[PDB]
């Protein structure tokens, strides 16, 4: 689908939600452990092209928050469903 440009704020520059979505996608997909260091995960996504789509500072920011939520999720009983 994805028919009809939602409303790209820019002309030829993907929106924040767009680029941000990409990075987050690989972050979870690649399997970026939460209880790990930015160094390890970094190299794990360093050879990735999408990694050059977002700023250097953001990458870390979005990563930190992503890990926080990934860790807290534990508090919950679990993904188990009856």
């Amino acid at each position: 689908g994805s028919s009809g440009s939602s409303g790209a704020r820019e002309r030829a520059i993907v929106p924040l939600e767009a680029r941000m979505k990409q990075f987050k996608d690989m972050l979870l997909e690649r399997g970026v452990s939460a209880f790990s260091t930015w160094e390890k995960e970094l190299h794990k996504i360093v050879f990735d092209p999408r990694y050059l789509l977002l700023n250097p500072k953001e990458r870390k920011q979005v990563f930190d928050q992503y890990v926080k939520t990934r860790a807290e999720e534990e508090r919950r009983s679990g993904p188990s469903s009856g």
Side-chain angles (χ1 to χ4, degrees):
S2 271
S3 183
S5 73
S6 303
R9 55 161 194 165
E10 273 281 47
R11 195 151 86 196
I13 297 168
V14 310
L16 173 79
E17 279 280 272
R19 53 197 208 193
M20 280 199 136
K21 271 286 281 290
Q22 300 180 263
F23 198 78
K24 205 165 276 157
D25 195 46
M26 49 175 232
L27 281 177
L28 192 72
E29 271 275 37
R30 280 278 88 73
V32 167
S33 194
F35 298 92
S36 270
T37 168
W38 160 252
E39 288 183 55
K40 276 182 191 77
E41 312 310 320
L42 163 77
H43 80 245
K44 288 185 172 274
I45 61 162
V46 77
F47 44 75
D48 198 74
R50 292 174 276 188
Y51 167 110
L52 310 160
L53 300 173
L54 280 177
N55 269 16
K57 178 183 83 198
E58 286 187 81
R59 286 164 208 164
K60 180 81 202 64
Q61 281 167 310
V62 173
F63 167 70
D64 193 275
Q65 90 190 5
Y66 161 98
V67 174
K68 208 183 87 179
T69 55
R70 280 289 84 198
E72 89 177 281
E73 201 280 304
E74 209 191 39
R75 211 210 199 169
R76 284 279 192 183
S77 60
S80 76
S81 42

